[PDB]
Amino acid sequence: APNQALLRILKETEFKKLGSGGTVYKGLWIPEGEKVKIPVAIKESPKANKEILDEAYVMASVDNPHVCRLLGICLTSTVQLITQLMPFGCLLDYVREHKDNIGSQYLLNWCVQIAKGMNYLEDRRLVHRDLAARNVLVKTPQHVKITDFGLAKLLGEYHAVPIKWMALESILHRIYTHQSDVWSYGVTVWELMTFGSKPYDGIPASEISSILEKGERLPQPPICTIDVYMIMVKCWMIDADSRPKFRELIIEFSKMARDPQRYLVIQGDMDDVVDADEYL
Ligand SMILES: *CCC(=O)Nc1cc(Nc2nccc(-c3c4n(c5ccccc35)CCCC4)n2)c(OC)cc1N(C)CCN(C)C
């Protein structure tokens, strides 16, 4: 099927410019005419351009409440990616910073929303290849979205990286599927339930392939009942088709979000501004 997505090109004079390592910035996008101010994030060598344009290609082709939307690109010195600003940051830093305030309702609901976004990416025949808690931003504490499609690939499995989030098949053979994304989903859920701990903390990345082959996995988080930990372990099966599907992960965590304290045991449980989701 033809990809009739629209690539929107933005005037640099329509911005009023967060993180470097390229550089991501924050700003306002004021389209000429319409009295409207959109809070945006602006991400500022031939290779780079091919890669930002590949990432821009992917984001322009997805449209889902739990996937980061692309607003457009600006064609200057280096190409800029303009996306919706997510004010609360990435989810990895957020659960670390608010460790003493994350309730089981928020944890289980984020798991539902991430699986919804990943399930949508599967519908678009898209393999994310880099699902992690650092790549999930927070619009509001009640609403998260998946991001960072720099590694994403469109399927017609994929034959080609963060070692501690990828499946054993991805490490041994470089094969990626939606089912290898389920593995990364499992590590991401583990990251949330441990309030931001680092997976396999201390183990260099080179022995990870040996550890997982001999049968070892990530430990059971303290707040996690066996019901939640079982779902994680299922995401880490050797046999990729034995792992759960994102549509099933939605159903399972949905049921748990209706009785959160049964599955997570936690102690003590600017005027014309328009968010990008309302500027269609
Ligand atoms: C987890 C780090 C981070 O995201 N911090 C952050 C982010 C935003 N808002 C926002 N909105 C859309 C996209 C992004 C973003 C950033 N980075 C990437 C990389 C790949 C894809 C998207 C993307 C790299 C790191 C910077 C942002 N970010 C935000 O809104 C005010 C505030 C923050 N924080 C918490 C500041 C970062 N802090 C660690 C100094």
Side-chain angles (χ1 to χ4, degrees), residues 167-186:
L168 185 102
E169 0 128 24
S170 305
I171 299 175
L172 267 54
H173 311 319
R174 304 163 165 172
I175 275 61
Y176 296 77
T177 319
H178 305 115
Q179 293 308 118
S180 59
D181 278 330
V182 173
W183 186 297
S184 304
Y185 180 85

Side-chain angles (χ1 to χ4, degrees), residues 79-93:
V79 175
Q80 309 191 134
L81 256 190
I82 292 90
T83 46
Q84 178 185 26
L85 180 68
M86 301 298 267
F88 292 88
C90 57
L91 195 45
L92 180 67
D93 287 15

